[PDB]
Amino acid sequence: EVKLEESGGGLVQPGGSMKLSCAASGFTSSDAWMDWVRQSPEKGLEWVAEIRNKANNHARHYNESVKGRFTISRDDSKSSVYLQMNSLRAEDSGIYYCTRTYYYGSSYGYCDVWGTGTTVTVSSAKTTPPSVYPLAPGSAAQTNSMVTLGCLVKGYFPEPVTVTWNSGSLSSGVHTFPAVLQSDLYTLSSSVTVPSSTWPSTVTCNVAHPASSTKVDKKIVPR
């Protein structure tokens, strides 16, 4: 089990600092060259930094964009790798993956192992719990064999929220939509489709927001 576990991500305002960590397992981290790679919707994948065998080499390399601000670091006794990030900018936002670009051999510079990732968000927007609104159909509706319900998770920050149905026990026919940003606040919808006999008799969407430590359940009630 070769494995890279990232940690340290979160929300910080522009100009602030953040230290990411990456625990390596299943191989000799001492003999490996480790990297941080970030991903965002705007720029796609971007290489950030690389630390080679220290310090016999010119060990550290940096994407031009983070020069002077970010420090990549190594502690082999802990079998882990770090990224100090100072003077953070909005465009430093993304999913930071910890990767490996060399273990052994004659080739290097491609990421043969990736972690899960940890998400950094750089913003002056304040943390805000969502409002959770039930979406019940109309009265006049004739109702087909299938029926669709929904939840509106409005006015929150930061990403992410976790949206499940009947405490996860309803997986199929559901659509959780990507959130959209308006006035430094996210809004997100989710729908779930079921047979007409099923509802009513009881559906409930589950909304958790880790950043504001809230967890709400709303039963969808007809009219």
Partner: protein, 213 residues
């Protein structure tokens, strides 16, 4: 910095078909190229390095080719597992840089969207805001348009739209449109309407409701 150019940005194909993604380069990199595969909600995974070498685990239906400034990834007899995002990356010399990726989508038969409209919940109305929501679910292909009408007149102002990524069960796309008004305006109007425009139909699919019923 070396610039990487992938084509196309998005591409759909049937299971079984053969496909070719092109990766261009702004200055010669010889054969120092890597290809990655990223599945939905997953980390990238190495497919190819040194232009042609497959990694441990990668099926032989995958082949990489090219040298200099032009490179290709060819997938034969496309399988269900092969769909996802694909990106190239040079491993010539730092700074390492990636292409903008290519979304490889599944081609399926055209399906019409299941449209559903939802009045604002009463407990939203207490906060002074009103959101009318419409779901356009399980359609193909992704090209679709929504048209909101209040009392027979269109409204473009106050609308926000979001698309899901292609569905992993049935290869469709879904969409949510949300018209947000002020509660005071919401309650001065009776009829609210949702109109989907998809290639599966000439006339749009109309869902609506009356507030005063």
């Amino acid at each position: 910095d070396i610039q990487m150019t992938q084509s196309p940005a998005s591409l759909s194909a049937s299971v079984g078909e053969t496909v070719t993604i092109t990766c261009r380069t702004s200055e010669n990199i010889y054969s120092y190229l890597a290809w990655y595969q990223q599945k939905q909600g997953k980390s990238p995974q190495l497919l190819v390095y040194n232009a042609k070498t497959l990694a441990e685990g990668v099926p032989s239906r995958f082949s990489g080719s090219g040298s200099g400034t032009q490179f290709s990834l060819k997938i034969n007899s496309l399988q269900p597992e092969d769909f996802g995002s694909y990106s190239c990356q040079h491993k010539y010399g730092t700074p390492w840089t990636f292409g903008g990726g290519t979304k490889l989508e599944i081609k399926r038969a055209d399906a019409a969207p299941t449209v559903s409209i939802f009045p604002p919940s009463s407990e939203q109305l207490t906060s002074g805001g009103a959101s009318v929501v419409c779901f356009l679910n399980n359609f193909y292909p992704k090209d679709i348009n929504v048209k909101w009408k209040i009392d027979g007149s269109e409204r473009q102002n106050g609308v926000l739209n979001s698309w899901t990524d292609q569905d992993s069960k049935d290869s469709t796309y879904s969409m949510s449109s949300t018209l947000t008004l002020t509660k005071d305006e919401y309650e001065r109007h009776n009829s609210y309407t949702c109109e989907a425009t998809h290639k599966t139909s000439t006339s749009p699919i109309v869902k609506s409701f009356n507030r005063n019923e």
